[PDB]
Design a binder for these strands. Structure first.
Length: 195
RNA sequence: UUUUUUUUU
């Protein structure tokens, strides 16, 4: 895929200012495979609050994914792959089925994103992040705000650099009393319990 | 407001 989905983009951001930023991130990081800018175009859906990046190569696109969660103009960008990948109802389940095509040779130690809820609606990114930082530096953090309203929805996602600290972060934060709400913290995917 | 608005402008 020579395309990437980038949501939670800054308001009023221009397509060109989205391009110049990514191309300048690809160069600073040295993630380019050949001379020239990787990002050829960017399309922004202002109302929907998202944009799509268009790369010249497939590998470069797969390299820009490392910028998921990067801070740009106070907004933590959400980078994902397009959804042109459909279930494809062609019938005769053989190249699909379920397992065939994605058996997974062996998933590496990854995915330790944490879900945080019960957060007061008045706290902002720099306040919430602080409460989380008290256990160690974060590698990715995003506070969900209403599309129109713009205020906190009451829950945010975060991931530390040192995953082990992830477990320590849940045991000390989960249940914490914030205002008139009870904080909730659990692995955003699997791991809401501890054996 | 306890799981984060994906398209060929």
């Amino acid at each position: 895929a020579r395309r990437l989905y980038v949501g939670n983009i800054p308001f009023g951001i221009t397509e060109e200012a989205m391009m110049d930023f990514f191309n300048a991130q690809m160069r600073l990081g040295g993630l380019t495979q050949a001379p020239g800018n990787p990002v050829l175009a960017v399309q922004i859906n202002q109302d929907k609050n998202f944009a799509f990046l268009e790369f010249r190569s497939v590998d470069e696109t797969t390299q820009a994914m490392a910028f998921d969660g990067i801070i740009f103009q106070g907004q933590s960008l959400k980078i994902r792959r397009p959804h042109d990948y459909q279930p494809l109802p062609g019938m005769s389940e053989n190249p699909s089925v379920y397992v065939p095509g994605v058996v997974s040779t062996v998933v590496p130690d990854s995915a330790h994103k944490l879900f945080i809820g019960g957060l007061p609606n008045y706290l902002n990114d720099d306040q919430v992040k602080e409460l989380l930082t008290s256990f160690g530096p974060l590698k990715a953090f995003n506070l969900v705000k209403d599309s129109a309203t713009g205020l906190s929805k009451g829950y945010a996602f975060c991931e530390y650099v040192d995953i082990n600290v992830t477990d320590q972060a849940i045991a000390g934060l989960n249940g914490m009393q914030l205002g008139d709400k009870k904080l909730l913290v659990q692995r955003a995917s699997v791991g809401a319990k501890n054996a």
